[PDB]
Amino acid sequence: NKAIIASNIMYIVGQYPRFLRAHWKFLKTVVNKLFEFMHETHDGVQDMACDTFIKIAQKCRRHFVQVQVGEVMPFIDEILNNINTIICDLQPQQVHTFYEAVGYMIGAQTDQTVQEHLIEKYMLLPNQVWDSIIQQATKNVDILKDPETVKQLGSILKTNVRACKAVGHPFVIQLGRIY
Amino acid sequence: LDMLNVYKCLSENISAAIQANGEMVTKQPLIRSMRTVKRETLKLISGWVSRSNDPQMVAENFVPPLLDAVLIDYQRNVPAAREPEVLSTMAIIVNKLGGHITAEIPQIFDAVFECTLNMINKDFEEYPEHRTNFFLLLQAVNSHCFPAFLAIPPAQFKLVLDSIIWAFKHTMRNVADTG
């Protein structure tokens, strides 16, 4: 029962960004609740929690990259310094939906310099796998024939596609780095 | 294939001429002409593998015929008749094929290594080109096919490492530096 209820609560709060955009503390509490639900093993809860999070990010993108009252650091920072601890229990596709969600936040930082640093760290986790697979291919190109490494190259790319859909032009700094 | 046959035909014609009348014969029309077919043959072989782009296909078709045709020929040649460019031609292919040839180092090093080493282990002067090239080869193998140095027995490996000592004791700047 609790999961069916929690989902509806999460659906309702997802439909009223106007209210979230006026009450940071609540928005904050909501996001964190979603981050917790992201380790929930009960059926569907993790799909629910991701749908809501991308939704909210899209419509409240500005509040995550600008410092709110009662804080001394933009929420994105906490989120980026913890990506792994949050998404560790998510499935491949959900991880993509999560990356797309943060991407929208990144797209809010119009300030060149800062948006660039945000982007570099945003794509840091996926980059490690990439950089790794790449150096090994520069020793033996029979590796790009390896079932597992090819499975990864796919998921890394898929992640790169979503981030780009949300970040927009500025994402060029990334594309250029691996193009 | 035929080109390798004629190469080998000439290579055996030259060595005999020398074995029968000493180095001197190299200083005359016909021999110098036969040396040319060999050298250009080697230019062609190495010149292509360099710009080739399918390592395995190259290591499984165009490399095995090199063994009997060029390597074991270089082995059976009299010291004065051996082509230094054989070693450098082989060096280039190792740089290109890399891991795809790591399994043939045994077969290769047999023919050329020890027999060439005995030409350059008396002093530090004779057979200059053979010194230079030999170590470009050894550099290459060590650089792109190190695993080979483990496959072989400790007795052979030692012989290799001490050969390096020998290199950097040279007064020819290039040979000592390669070492």
Swiss-Prot record, chain A:
Subunit (UniProt): Found in a U snRNA export complex with PHAX/RNUXA, NCBP1/CBP80, NCBP2/CBP20, RAN, XPO1 and m7G-capped RNA. Component of a nuclear export receptor complex composed of KPNB1, RAN, SNUPN and XPO1. Found in a trimeric export complex with SNUPN, RAN and XPO1. Found in a nuclear export complex with RANBP3 and RAN. Found in a 60S ribosomal subunit export complex with NMD3, RAN, XPO1. Interacts with DDX3X, NMD3, NUP42, NUP88, NUP214, RANBP3 and TERT. Interacts with NEMF (via its N-terminus). Interacts with the monomeric form of BIRC5/survivin deacetylated at 'Lys-129'.
Residue stretches of each HEAT repeat: 25-62, 67-104
Protein name: Exportin-1
Domain of life the protein comes from: Eukaryota
Endpoints of the signal sequence: none
Full-length numbering of the shown residues: 536 to 714 of 1071
Function: Mediates the nuclear export of cellular proteins (cargos) bearing a leucine-rich nuclear export signal (NES) and of RNAs. In the nucleus, in association with RANBP3, binds cooperatively to the NES on its target protein and to the GTPase Ran in its active GTP-bound form. Docking of this complex to the nuclear pore complex (NPC) is mediated through binding to nucleoporins. Upon transit of a nuclear export complex into the cytoplasm, disassembling of the complex and hydrolysis of Ran-GTP to Ran-GDP (induced by RANBP1 and RANGAP1, respectively) cause release of the cargo from the export receptor.
UniProt organism field: Mus musculus (Mouse)
Subcellular location: Cytoplasm; Nucleus, Nucleoplasm; Nucleus, Cajal body; Nucleus, Nucleolus
Sites bearing N6-acetyllysine, chain numbering: 158
Family: Belongs to the exportin family.
